Design a protein around this ligand. Structure first.
Ligand SMILES: O=C(N[C@@H]1CCCNC[C@H]1NC(=O)c1ccncc1)c1ccc(C(=O)c2cc(N3CCCCC3)ccc2O)cc1
Lengths: 333, 20
């Protein structure tokens, strides 16, 4: 599959799909999330009656925060990839004021919501999710893509209880090294913090943070201010809840490894250092891929368009100016 | 407890990305 996958991806990467629907083809139902330049809304595609999640970004706000290239990355990558645990982009378009991405609606809510409410996940429930990320990072990294924003907030749970990765704002196709200070503080690898130049290994570090956080219910480095988190990441040592298994600790010690010649996922054996670790001894990797494993948790679902696995957000009307904004900047979107 | 320290911290909600 990984052979056929790069071929398919490069074709879409090189000739991206553009302008494949219009705003007026969608009824706007409810906000499912926000960010600094817009929001994701539940919508219904009037023609098919299907529900989707629509991300709306304000072009002027994106320019203000100098995120043009990152938003062009997000859509170009998302329209080109294809994997069971990546949210599927269905349509993309833009108008005078906004950018739109219409994706699968993933009705189970964010892992974030379930994780905070429950406290923490059991090692088997955490492992189930971690396996899916391992495979998604194997796929992405095979295409020279770094994800750079792994966290429970970006992992949506579908009706089958499997993960769908969303929010590709910091994803970037890079061979070799890149330098942008970006990500979420709790999940940043030390090399990002230290402005060294860094590569796909930052995703493997982040996987360590996510596993820790799933299993403990809090992340390995927290504090009230980002800068204090950074200091812990760089100069501090990881300590584990007494309930962590010896195998979980050994895995996390190898993922939350400052030294790049020693970090799992960055060795010559690559992803298999992780796949063949004892913590994953119960994981049938092909069965996870094919979604044949019974999920440990299945969200409550009461028909489509139901949003009770999501928080409520203040609604505001989508405004579209009569004058085109930032046309040049977003030409290729 | 570490749990108590987390719950009392300002980082238990949805975390934003950073850009410089
Ligand atoms: O609402 C959003 N995403 C939701 C909620 C946040 C947590 N991630 C889950 C996501 N929900 C879904 O995508 C979803 C998809 C399908 N079904 C249900 C939910 C969202 C809305 C707008 C943005 C957004 O404005 C945005 C901002 C940034 N940065 C701002 C800080 C400085 C660095 C650049 C970068 C790229 C972006 O695209 C990002 C996210």
């Amino acid at each position: 599959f990984l052979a056929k996958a790069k071929e398919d991806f490069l074709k879409k990467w090189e000739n991206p799909a553009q302008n494949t629907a219009h705003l007026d083809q969608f009824e706007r139902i409810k906000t499912l999330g926000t960010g600094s330049f817009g929001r994701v809304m539940l919508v219904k595609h009037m023609e098919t009656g299907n529900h989707y999640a629509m991300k709306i970004l304000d072009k002027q706000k994106v320019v203000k925060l100098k995120q043009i290239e990152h938003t062009l990355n997000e859509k170009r990558i998302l329209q080109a990839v294809n994997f069971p645990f990546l949210v599927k982009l269905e349509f993309s378009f833009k108008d005078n004021s906004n950018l739109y991405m219409v994706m699968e609606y993933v009705p189970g809510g964010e892992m974030f919501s379930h994780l905070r409410r429950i406290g923490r996940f059991s090692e088997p429930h955490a492992r189930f999710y971690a396996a899916q990320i391992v495979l998604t990072f194997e796929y992405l990294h095979s295409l020279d893509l770094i994800y750079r924003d792994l966290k429970p907030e970006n992992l949506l749970i579908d009706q089958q209880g499997y993960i769908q990765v969303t929010d590709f704002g910091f994803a970037k196709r890079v061979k070799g090294r890149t330098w942008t200070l970006c990500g979420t503080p709790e999940y940043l690898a030390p090399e990002i913090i230290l402005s060294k130049g860094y590569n796909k290994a930052v995703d493997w570090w982040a996987l360590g943070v996510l596993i820790y956080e799933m299993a403990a219910g809090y992340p390995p480095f927290f504090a009230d201010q980002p800068i204090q988190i950074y200091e812990k990441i760089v100069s501090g040592k990881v300590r584990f809840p007494s309930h962590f298994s010896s195998d979980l600790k050994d895995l996390l010690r190898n993922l939350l490894q400052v030294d790049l010649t020693k970090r799992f996922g960055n060795l010559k054996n690559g992803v298999n250092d992780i796949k063949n670790h004892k913590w994953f001894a119960t994981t049938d990797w092909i069965a996870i891929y094919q979604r044949k494993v019974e999920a440990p948790f299945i969200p409550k679902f009461k028909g489509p368009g139901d949003t009770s696995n999501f928080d409520d957000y203040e609604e505001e009307e989508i405004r579209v100016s009569i004058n085109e904004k930032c046309g040049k900047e977003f030409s290729e979107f | 407890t570490t749990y108590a320290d987390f719950i009392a911290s300002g980082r238990t909600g949805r975390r934003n990305a950073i850009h410089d």
